[PDB]
């Protein structure tokens, strides 16, 4: 046959046909009926069971090369659509799927060609990828000379290649790195210069190629026993199957209608401790991620991000592939926790990411090295939206106020206690607080949005990898969102530099803004802040038996460590993002993990839960009365107990104080409107709105209508007084010729 | 014959043999006799003259695929040694040759295999390259299924990427094509490294077109004159070059030891050097001492013991870059021939100590703008070679040295076409040259990496950049004073016009003049910065007020500043900056440096001093203070010489010199007190501290000359500045199963 796909179609003729049938019918590949599944139920169930089991075995067997992370493997059909994904974080199902769809639309079939036993590698920025260090290995599967699918394997390399602002600070575009199952030497020598340490990159490549070739054999054996006729139907029915599964889940758990929510997070690049080389990049900006969620009677739904802010000079921007592919690590935690999850769910979801926004920049200068900062801040709002549907329908067990900001990313560089390059960081922000439920408190220090199987790691293992020692590891008091049910609290650890040389560290996380919100009366989780101490003189303080900082920063409004370090240079502020800073032995670094949002009116919380929280270190005593209205009294055993009568009076008094200090929304609005007309707000607020308007006309109209603003009132970004480089002149990807990108999104 | 090289040897077996014969015999490839040259001279001269011409033809023909000068092509033998090189800048003969020898040593023959019609590409930093944007295309030449040589084509791509870099796009001899056809995944992947696609794509089409033309040339020559004759020429030609350099040294120079040194400043402690790493935020000085030894047999040695350590900046150099590009200056004085090839390398001994900025041996080091250190280190060699010319009697060949190729005008953003900016004006191609022992230096005439200096037309530059010329003027008092004055630089005043999202920065020497005067002459003027933001020039122009024009004639008594009362003027000695925002009607002074002078300025003929004042080469005030010449403004407003007054001023300055000078012994004792008290700037002590550790022989001489006790030490960690990288290295030896080539004693 002429084309290499089974049947004689080229890779592009094949996909274009399926995509045309998908558009005309609304069903993947125009499969109005799934004959294999309906006519042969057992064989269909067996095909998933064996293929799913073999894909997981590849992932776990290949994993056994350590000294799990983003490691994952996915089986695709000829058109680049996922059928099955292994255990692990599934944020790369779409990134690798896009890499296949890039080879399809750019005629890789003709050059460099797609042959059996070829090995392709990819991490391209313009195709779509979460992190530059996330390396894809893609292998085509052939049966009797014809192509029937692809295999994808991905890892997060931890030692690849300060204060990046533009993309031009590596890139692999579906490069053919091997043939005949043998890697090319020029690729091996070249890729080992893209890295500071060789061991991690080399083993990771072996792992990916291993798992891929296992899965390749796994398919060749399934097809041999059950026949190609059966497998060929399954490779397209399984996708249309996933779509029907998502539709059935929506109709069963949620409510049709329109849900509107928004999320924010800060980017404080004006601070002197953010040492970026470009002066046009030094300004305070805020991420704006509004979302209009539409759930329809037919079980389809739509996520429209009209009104979002523009991309900025920083590393927190994202890709439309990165945004849509990675949003399912969140969705599979509430709506579709299923091992059948595949691209079928994608074909049952509509995404609108306006071109030019931070989630769909369409500009080649954009950097995305730390996309998580924005992604986790934008996705959390969707928890709240869905929860409104769960709450109204009665499935309160599924309600969740949202995920915490996966923040304070402890990052360090230099030479460790073995006089060797640092490569492995602690990664304690895998265990943040979780949002509160409509039924119970949230889980403290339990999970991250991109991995619900939160693991905090052992202190004794991290101290074998980092030149740091734990002086404390403690639950972060009052970090969880207050509410009838408290959001999960984060936790903190105090690090002391120990046997480090040429050492540097920086902070990474939300500071001025709490990305998550409480739900239906609950409050947002605590926001971030920084603590670090240099020139502590701790060696002499330890030797002399003086007071030394231990534990966690219990009350940063009334700290106890600072006074213990009189000769120290202490940095204690809300600057939760910094650039590389010099550290040396006996200096201190507070690693503070965020908490989750709360649920419900705080003064509906059962008083004993407040007393249990104070005794447990989840809430500072101070706020027991101010926030929850609970009067607690310390007893003989040192434990706090509830004052039943005193609480009732406090709760009744707060209710009157609320009505007194509050104001009718009509009244407050006209006052806020005067400030809007006078353009009275910080530059970060005005820049956010000014940029959001230009990229979102529908958002500007609603804003003007809601505030009853006259057309005479305008908010041009160019008149705020901050740099605006990149707001009117762009570097589109359309400038690149011979490059055909695929659109997974309305814009 | 299994090995692909002619005869059956593999590439490594072949080179390994030739290199062992070179080490053993002191003659390239163990050629004690050149049979072809001696027994068939006409045929020998014919092969060279014809290959040289065919190579030049390929370079000039391919050049017509755009519209540069760094473009160049080189013909190599099977072992990766240069035979011939096209017209153009020859910095990349060694870099590309090193790429070939990398494929030889790392078994490219077995994987990915070296086949006919294959296309390779390379710019690797660890192999050694001048610039990250200088891209190599390497094609193997075959004859009857066997490899007989290589072709290398290079271009300087202007629109690549990568800020205030402090530590380290790498293409490691990648096979980017087969069957003379490029791979699609390579073409797509390359269009993401560049800002605009045009320049990258035409440059590759240019390199390949030239490589294939040279491949056809060899195939044609071999076919007509026979492969037997060519296979002899392909190695005799190298040894031939070695003998040629030996003859030139013995005919032009003098045996002995020459000692010289050069310096340049890295002022990274200034706030306008926005660097992301705080441990790279300090002031440092480059130290480039050179002990030059010419032996009686005609061999010579270049020992850079005592040089400073690599730093957190983009001015470090690879050993291959330092030795491959040094021949751009050697071909301007010692061996200016079109026959130049690697024979000159096998006739020269280089010692670049490991850890120094020229041989860092650390993977973190960056090399983006290594010219700043190279031009400052090479200028000292002119002076050494000149002492041999001057003693032997070839005063015409003397030259005090090359100016720092500084102020590198760099701009970014969007231009008057609302398109990405990629073409910057290249006025630092026309710096002042060093004065000779016979005549003044040439003003605004050349750079060290290109003697064919061209300034460009202002009208052409304004079609490329969003800038307009408000001035273009000879730089007064930039040339080094002396009996014969060093060449003066020039300066242009630029106004930003129709730019958007525009940024600019300065680049060059500031506190230090790298060049020195010779035998009584003085160094050229050092660098400084002038820029003006928020000028309000639009209204000053409209109202008819004074507007800055021309050049910054006297920065000690400027005229522009008073004209700009509302402007933010940056007028300091910070000649290196990171990108800074610029808007229309802002000003940027592009000041090109001059060259060093020769001889005692007091021995300069007075009428030359008067001509210099009249011509804007020397400011009036220095005619008496420096040259001791009294001038009077004549009727026509021109300056003339006062013979009698000049004779007195010269007689008085001679007494002043003896009165204000002191015996060197008396000065040394006082300067020795300061060394013991460690009374000096941190940039000075860090330089010496780093130099001592890398050069024990240099430290030994320092302590000896100053009679310092062993109790006196200068540890770098006690200076008070960051010392990151001094004690902990990421040596390249770590990288697994990567085999490097040492062209240097380290
Ligand atoms: Mn990753
Ligand atoms: Mn170059």
From Swiss-Prot, chain A:
One of its GO terms (biological process) is cellular detoxification of acetone. Its cofactor is Fe cation; Mg(2+); Zn(2+). One of its GO terms (molecular function) is acetone carboxylase activity. InterPro entries: Hydantoinase_B. The N-terminus is blocked. Keywords: ATP-binding, Ligase, Nucleotide-binding. Zn(2+). The heterohexamer contains tightly bound iron, manganese and zinc ions. Optimum pH is 7.6. Its EC number is 6.4.1.6. Signal peptide: none annotated. It catalyses: acetone + hydrogencarbonate + 2 ATP + 3 H2O = acetoacetate + 2 AMP + 4 phosphate + 4 H(+). The keyword Lyase does not apply. Catalyzes the carboxylation of acetone to form acetoacetate. Has a reduced activity on butanone, and no activity on 2-pentatone, 3-pentatone, 2-hexanone, chloroacetone, pyruvate, phosphoenolpyruvate, acetaldehyde, propionaldehyde and propylene oxide. Belongs to the oxoprolinase family. Heterohexamer of two alpha, two beta and two gamma subunits. This is Acetone carboxylase alpha subunit. It comes from Xanthobacter autotrophicus (strain ATCC BAA-1158 / Py2).
UniProtKB/Swiss-Prot annotation, chain B:
Zn(2+). The heterohexamer contains tightly bound iron, manganese and zinc ions. One of its GO terms (molecular function) is ATP binding. GO terms for biological process: cellular detoxification of acetone. Its cofactor is Fe cation; Mg(2+); Zn(2+). Keywords: ATP-binding, Ligase, Nucleotide-binding. Belongs to the oxoprolinase family. Catalyzes the carboxylation of acetone to form acetoacetate. Has a reduced activity on butanone, and no activity on 2-pentatone, 3-pentatone, 2-hexanone, chloroacetone, pyruvate, phosphoenolpyruvate, acetaldehyde, propionaldehyde and propylene oxide. Heterohexamer of two alpha, two beta and two gamma subunits. This is Acetone carboxylase alpha subunit. It comes from Xanthobacter autotrophicus (strain ATCC BAA-1158 / Py2). The lineage of its organism: Bacteria, Pseudomonadati, Pseudomonadota, Alphaproteobacteria, Hyphomicrobiales.
């Amino acid at each position: 046959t002429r084309g290499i796909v089974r049947g004689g179609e080229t890779l592009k003729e094949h996909r274009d046909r399926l995509m045309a049938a998908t558009k005309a019918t609304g069903r993947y590949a125009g499969l109005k009926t799934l004959e294999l599944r309906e006519r042969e139920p057992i064989l269909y169930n067996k095909l998933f069971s064996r293929l799913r089991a073999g894909v997981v075995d590849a992932r776990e067997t290949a994993k056994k090369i350590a000294a799990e992370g983003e490691l994952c493997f996915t089986l695709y059909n000829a058109a680049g659509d996922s059928l099955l994904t292994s255990t692990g974080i599934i944020i790369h199902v779409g990134t690798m799927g896009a890499a296949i769809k890039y080879m399809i639309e750019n005629n890789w079939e003709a050059n460099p060609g797609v042959h059996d036993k070829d090995i392709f590698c990819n991490n391209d920025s313009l195709i779509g990828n979460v992190h530059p260090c996330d390396i894809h290995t893609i292998v085509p599967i052939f049966w009797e000379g014809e192509l029937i699918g692809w295999v994808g394997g991905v890892t997060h390399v931890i030692d690849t290649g300060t204060g990046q602002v533009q993309r031009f600070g590596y890139s692999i575009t579906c490069r053919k790195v091997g043939a005949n199952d043998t890697l090319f030497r020029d690729w091996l020598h070249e890729s080992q210069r893209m890295v500071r340490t060789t061991r991690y990159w080399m083993l990771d490549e072996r792992t990916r190629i291993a798992g891929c070739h296992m899965i390749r054999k796994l398919v060749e054996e399934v097809v041999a026993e059950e026949g190609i006729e059966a497998y060929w139907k399954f490779a397209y029915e399984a996708v249309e199957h996933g779509r029907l599964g998502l539709q059935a889940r929506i109709k069963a758990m949620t409510i049709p209608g329109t849900y509107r929510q928004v999320g924010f997070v800060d980017v404080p690049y004006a601070h002197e401790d953010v040492r970026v080389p470009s002066d046009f990049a030094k300004l305070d900006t805020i991420m704006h991620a509004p979302c209009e969620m539409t759930i329809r009677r037919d079980g389809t739904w739509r996520l429209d991000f009209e009104g979002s802010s523009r991309w900025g000079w920083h590393t927190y921007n994202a890709h439309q592939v990165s945004f849509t592919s990675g949003i399912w690590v969140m969705m599979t935690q509430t709506l579709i926790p299923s091992e059948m999850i595949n691209d079928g769910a994608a074909y049952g979801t509509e995404f609108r990411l306006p071109k030019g926004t931070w989630m769909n920049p369409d500009d080649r200068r954009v950097a995305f090295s730390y996309s998580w900062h924005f992604l986790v801040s934008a996705w959390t709002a969707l928890w709240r939206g869905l929860s409104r549907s769960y709450f109204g329908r009665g499935y309160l067990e599924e309600v969740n106020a949202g995920n915490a900001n996966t923040s304070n990313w402890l990052q360090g560089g230099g030479f460790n206690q073995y006089d060797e390059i640092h490569a492995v960081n602690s990664f304690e922000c895998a265990a943040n607080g979780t949002g509160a439920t409509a039924v119970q408190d949230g889980l403290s220090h339990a999970a991250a949005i991109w991995n619900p199987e939160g693991d905090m790691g052992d202190m004794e293992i991290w101290e074998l990898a980092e030149p740091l020692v734990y002086l404390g590891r403690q639950i972060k008091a009052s970090s969880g969102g207050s509410g009838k049910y408290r959001g999960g609290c984060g936790f903190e650890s105090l690090r002391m530099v120990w046997n480090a040389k040429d050492w540097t560290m920086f902070f990474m996380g939300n500071g001025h803004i709490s990305s998550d919100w409480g739900l239906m009366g609950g409050y947002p989780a605590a926001s971030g802040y920084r603590f670090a101490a240099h020139k502590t003189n701790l060696k002499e303080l330890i030797a002399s038996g003086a007071e030394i900082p231990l534990g966690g920063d219990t009350d940063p409004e009334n700290p106890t460590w600072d006074a213990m370090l009189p000769d120290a240079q202490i940095k204690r502020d809300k600057q939760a993002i910094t650039t590389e800073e010099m550290f040396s032995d006996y200096d201190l670094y507070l690693n503070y993990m965020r908490g989750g949002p709360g649920f419900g009116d705080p003064l509906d919380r059962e008083p004993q839960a407040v007393a249990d929280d104070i005794n447990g270190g989840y809430v500072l005593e101070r706020f027991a009365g101010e926030v929850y209205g609970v009067v607690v009294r310390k007893g003989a055993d040192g434990q706090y107990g509830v004052d039943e009568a005193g609480t009732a009076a406090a709760r009744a008094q707060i209710r009157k104080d609320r009505l007194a200090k509050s104001v009718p929304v009509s009244e407050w609005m006209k006052g806020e409107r005067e400030k809007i007309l006078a353009k009275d707000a910080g530059t970060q607020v005005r820049q956010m709105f000014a940029a959001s308007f230009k990229l979102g006309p529908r958002f500007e109209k609603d804003f003007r209508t809601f505030w009853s603003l006259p057309d005479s009132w305008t908010l041009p970004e160019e008149e705020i007084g901050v740099p605006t480089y990149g707001s009117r002149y762009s570097m589109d990807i359309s400038e690149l010729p011979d490059v055909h990108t695929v659109q997974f999104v309305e814009e």
